[PDB]
Amino acid sequence: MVPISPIETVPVKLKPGMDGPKVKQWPLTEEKIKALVEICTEMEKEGKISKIGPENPYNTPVFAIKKKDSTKWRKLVDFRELNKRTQDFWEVQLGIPHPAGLKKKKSVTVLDVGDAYFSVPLDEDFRKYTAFTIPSINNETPGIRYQYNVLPQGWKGSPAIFQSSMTKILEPFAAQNPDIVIYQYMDDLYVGSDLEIGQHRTKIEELRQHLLRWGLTTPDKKHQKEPPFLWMGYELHPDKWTVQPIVLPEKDSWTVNDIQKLVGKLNWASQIYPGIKVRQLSKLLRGTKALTEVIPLTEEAELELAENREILKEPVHGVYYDPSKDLIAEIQKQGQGQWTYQIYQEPFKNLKTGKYARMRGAHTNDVKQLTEAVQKITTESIVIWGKTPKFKLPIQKETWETWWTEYWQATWIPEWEFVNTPPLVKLWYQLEKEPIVGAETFYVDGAANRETKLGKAGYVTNKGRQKVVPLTNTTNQKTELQAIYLALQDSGLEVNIVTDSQYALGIIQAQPDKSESELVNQIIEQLIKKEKVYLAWVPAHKGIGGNEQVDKLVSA
Amino acid sequence: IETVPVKLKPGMDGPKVKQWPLTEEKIKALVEICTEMEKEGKISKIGPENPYNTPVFAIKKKDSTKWRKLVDFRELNKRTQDFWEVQLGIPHPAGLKKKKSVTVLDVGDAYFSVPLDEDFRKYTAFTIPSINNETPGIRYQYNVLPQGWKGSPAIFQSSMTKILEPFKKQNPDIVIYQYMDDLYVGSDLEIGQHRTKIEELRQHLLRWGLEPPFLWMGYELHPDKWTVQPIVLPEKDSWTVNDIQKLVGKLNWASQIYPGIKVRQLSKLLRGTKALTEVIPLTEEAELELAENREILKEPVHGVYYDPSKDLIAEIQKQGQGQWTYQIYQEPFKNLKTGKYARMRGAHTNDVKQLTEAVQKITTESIVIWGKTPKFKLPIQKETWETWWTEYWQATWIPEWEFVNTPPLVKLWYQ
Ligand SMILES: Cc1cc(/C=C/C#N)cc(C)c1Nc1ccnc(Nc2ccc(C#N)cc2)n1
Ligand SMILES: [Mg+2]
């Protein structure tokens, strides 16, 4: 015999304070029992399970399934209860590689390592918790009690311990063969390289010899699986990648579930298909949760769907990452808070695409949204490629500088360049820093009665111009905004406005260009038409003249 | 050499904090650092039966091209027991803030000489991520006291006290204060002497060491010169209606801090509905009220005390042209320190680098004055801060922070 190196066992514990499972074995038909007895006799012969005495108090139910081959029965040990009681593990699968971050490979060979899958030893002290019982024929003898000596399929810790054990075995080979890549998925090893095919196959033979040191045998035939690979919703080819075929169904009526599946397929396609949009389709799911409910599609949703079908009408492929070249990220504004981007290194060959949507909120502007999209893409790029791309943005350098130097928050976007492709992001208005000489001064105020929801909004000015408007179904805050709106509608191109509304100042100082409040949108549309606006704040109820007069007129 | 038992707070599990994305440069640096540490026995590889995690990254300290490993133990530090057994706590030295020079030394390397309780090691687990998650992350745990863990100075205290005894006896007027991995050394000497006493101090730890990669460095502070920012009102010969309105606004705000502030006479100058740029002569009544307000503002605030059982809160405002104002308090309107910065190093085009250096400076001042870090309210969107702060960090500690999304009117009053 050739001595094999053993796989060290991972020590496993139950969660603090919990004991093992003690679950009743269900009754089974005489036919299923015979099937389980034969199956387990072979598993015992292979070393995977071991017959036990009656002292062990633990138990997990075992079932027989069938339907795969000659309708022959299969075996299923239901570890749901043990899983609840088993400690948490470190999971490595949580991070899936993105295809756009992979490198081009000349050759990728697949090896089957499923013999290893069911041969990793289980911590000796934990085996007792895996006990199960095959019921006896007619319940006239004790059932056949057993326990697992190997990582049990269906047990919480088996995937993590298998991956850790294989990674430990492969680490020396990979470190000493830096001209290949190795990736484990399920019961397969994928080995890629750029070597000529003879050297590549040699490395594969060397990898097979390395695995035999731990007693791990690999099928000596050609693995069925060959490029392209269907993996995690992708198609991987040697020099290109794409998402698996995206087929949008035809339907005369759509249910909530239908739209959820459409949005899923569109979101998935958004990583390589440029310009996918889902706003109007996702709007149809707002606040609803009846999966069988049929929603009529807006004309807005029908155009968006029609535009998506056009984008999806033929296959689009992405390229892989060349580390010797810079990454470029280009962003476009799409409307309604939607942004789309492409990341590429060579012109016209995207590594990946994507989209960003405005966050829910009362007020917003294009510059903030663009900034947010940049920070999203930067973080995504760090994960996939480990570096920040150079950005191409539809915003003029001078617009950005005016924005960040005068914005009340700190803000920053990394190395970028203006790309002149409309619609451009711009600043629609800019408040003055100093009062305007020669411009009429409007002192504005509003007030409402909290019970009757009646109010007044108005202004008085230095030229003797005045207005008070009575309002219904309003609040103090709305009347504060209405008063500012009135001063804007009634002034010339340059105007000073004095308010005591902290609420209104907080909104305008956030510089929205679009709002959930139609009253704020009306103010914004007025501000855009002015040439100069100075907005001044004073404290209420302090005898500040001008202020004092109009608060009296409006609180009456 | 034999370990101090450590445990977590009651009813409290270990940290399970996601590793955030790291740049290729930081990963390569961490791989090199951790490979060496593993060979020297400071850390060991761990298996999947350890589900804990603390984020890690790397920093290039001021005036050094060597990368330093920084573990973000904020969550572990919250979850670790309080060490009120070694001492009820070392009374914060109030003289440290009064020395003309204080040098900050990185002494964290000394901690690696003390083993860590084998029953606690699992909670210091961390991961070196791979680009694109193409290979499994490298998982380690510490075998020795880690840099950045609040237990490290507590457990090493007894050893630090005896290493430093010869230097302290021989230099009794020196104030030495330890905060986490930092040693703060304050003297009233001329700087040349100061720098030579600092170097004297280095060789006590070199001697004892027998090499630490960052002990040679020296961050020099001068807390006796640290400036504060009282409330001042303009002195003008010509007041416009706008100037008087801004004055009345500022005085109304100041009257939440200072009781006897009055604006009646100044607000009656705003008598009518005048153009904002119109000049208003002050009445005698208004001049008097203004002068009385000025003299009130020259006094300290009433009822301001530090309470060590309460959090310090630091607020920061962006004032433009590289200027930032800040206030530290525990109770609103009861500022314990206010200040203003303008020397934003190498960041005239980068708001976020400036803000990050302000946060570090305010934390340093906080450690020197009270011996703990403040909780920040930052004028920045969370996403922007989370994406860039680590690129500009040069400190070995990390404070807590929250984000301000609504613009304060108070910005105007601290300008
Ligand atoms: C993540 C991953 C999944 C699969 C396979 C999953 C499956 N099924 C196979 C391999 C080898 C990898 N590993 C890596 C690592 C770095 N670059 C690459 N490039 C790369 C991989 C495959 C093809 C192809 N065809 C082309 C390039 N692969
Ligand atoms: Mg009012």
Side-chain angles (χ1 to χ4, degrees), chain A residues 457-476:
Chain A
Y459 60 72
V460 300
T461 88
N462 63 301
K463 286 208 298 191
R465 180 194 329 262
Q466 302 195 354
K467 175 176 281 182
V468 180
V469 177
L471 302 164
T472 64
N473 198 41
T474 189
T475 64
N476 279 322

Side-chain angles (χ1 to χ4, degrees), chain A residues 399-458:
Chain A
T399 296
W400 178 248
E401 197 179 18
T402 295
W403 165 254
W404 78 257
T405 55
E406 301 296 330
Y407 189 45
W408 73 275
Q409 290 192 326
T411 190
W412 161 253
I413 66 181
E415 180 172 337
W416 63 279
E417 262 170 2
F418 168 56
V419 56
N420 181 12
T421 71
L424 301 189
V425 170
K426 61 176 230 168
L427 294 172
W428 291 92
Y429 59 89
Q430 303 154 50
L431 271 293
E432 296 298 298
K433 294 168 188 147
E434 285 306 312
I436 303 149
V437 171
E440 189 170 359
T441 296
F442 285 68
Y443 296 79
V444 304
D445 202 7
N449 181 285
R450 304 81 71 111
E451 311 76 318
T452 77
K453 281 181 85 33
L454 299 176
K456 295 176 173 179

Side-chain angles (χ1 to χ4, degrees), chain A residues 445-447 480 500 540-541 547 550-552 554-555:
Chain A
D445 202 7
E480 261 146 9
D500 54 73
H541 301 308
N547 174 67
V550 63
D551 163 58
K552 190 153 237 23
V554 305
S555 297

Side-chain angles (χ1 to χ4, degrees), chain B residues 112-210 212-310:
Chain B
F112 294 151
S113 67
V114 169
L116 178 68
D117 174 22
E118 283 247 354
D119 319 317
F120 199 79
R121 294 183 184 183
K122 56 190 175 168
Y123 299 129
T124 69
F126 63 94
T127 320
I128 304 182
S130 74
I131 294 182
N132 204 36
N133 320 117
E134 279 166 16
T135 58
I138 307 166
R139 294 272 292 162
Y140 292 107
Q141 72 187 13
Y142 272 87
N143 300 318
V144 300
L145 301 179
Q147 292 176 142
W149 177 50
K150 94 172 161 183
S152 296
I155 289 171
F156 194 81
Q157 219 193 123
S158 60
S159 324
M160 180 70 76
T161 298
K162 144 192 181 323
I163 297 172
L164 293 188
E165 218 69 284
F167 185 91
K168 282 234 285 285
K169 204 150 109 153
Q170 183 74 330
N171 300 271
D173 293 328
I174 306 307
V175 185
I176 302 172
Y177 173 69
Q178 186 172 196
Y179 182 80
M180 311 305 288
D181 304 348
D182 285 350
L183 204 66
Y184 295 79
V185 176
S187 83
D188 288 323
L189 291 53
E190 161 256 330
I191 185 190
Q193 263 154 120
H194 179 80
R195 304 201 171 141
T196 285
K197 306 311 286 200
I198 299 303
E199 181 64 337
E200 261 184 55
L201 194 44
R202 292 194 185 101
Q203 313 274 160
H204 279 257
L205 271 153
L206 301 303
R207 284 201 271 301
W208 165 89
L210 268 339
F214 300 110
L215 187 55
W216 67 272
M217 267 148 18
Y219 182 30
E220 300 181 336
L221 312 170
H222 301 286
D224 68 327
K225 324 222 81 73
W226 281 349
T227 50
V228 316
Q229 275 245 289
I231 305 170
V232 301
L233 311 174
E235 293 186 11
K236 294 181 177 285
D237 294 331
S238 313
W239 294 82
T240 64
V241 165
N242 191 59
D243 294 329
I244 302 176
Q245 289 180 356
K246 289 189 307 167
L247 173 64
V248 169
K250 189 178 291 198
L251 287 169
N252 183 66
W253 162 78
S255 74
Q256 302 172 281
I257 298 160
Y258 286 90
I261 294 288
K262 274 62 211 143
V263 303
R264 189 170 94 114
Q265 302 306 309
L266 280 153
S267 297
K268 98 189 21 187
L269 295 166
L270 276 359
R271 211 124 242 202
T273 301
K274 301 169 186 282
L276 277 196
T277 60
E278 181 170 306
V279 173
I280 309 303
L282 297 196
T283 60
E284 53 179 20
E285 301 86 297
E287 137 248 293
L288 173 56
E289 175 177 276
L290 178 52
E292 285 159 339
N293 288 330
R294 274 189 215 281
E295 301 276 60
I296 286 170
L297 292 174
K298 294 202 291 213
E299 300 180 344
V301 177
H302 183 63
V304 176
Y305 68 103
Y306 171 68
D307 173 355
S309 76
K310 288 192 290 203

Side-chain angles (χ1 to χ4, degrees), chain A residues 11 87-90 97-98 101 103 375 383-384 386 404 407-411 441 443 462 505 534 542-543 545-546, chain B residues 16 23-24 48-49 131-134 242 252 267 270 272-274 276 318 349-351 379 381 387-388 404 409:
Chain A
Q87 67 166 93
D88 289 333
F89 295 87
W90 189 247
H98 196 283
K103 273 60 58 178
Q375 312 301 351
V383 169
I384 300 176
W404 78 257
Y407 189 45
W408 73 275
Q409 290 192 326
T411 190
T441 296
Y443 296 79
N462 63 301
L505 201 83
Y534 179 70
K542 290 292 176 199
Chain B
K16 291 187 183 183
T23 55
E24 180 178 5
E49 81 282 13
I131 294 182
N132 204 36
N133 320 117
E134 279 166 16
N242 191 59
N252 183 66
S267 297
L270 276 359
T273 301
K274 301 169 186 282
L276 277 196
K318 176 182 162 188
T349 52
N350 185 330
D351 261 352
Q381 287 300 100
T387 305
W388 298 111
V404 180
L409 261 163

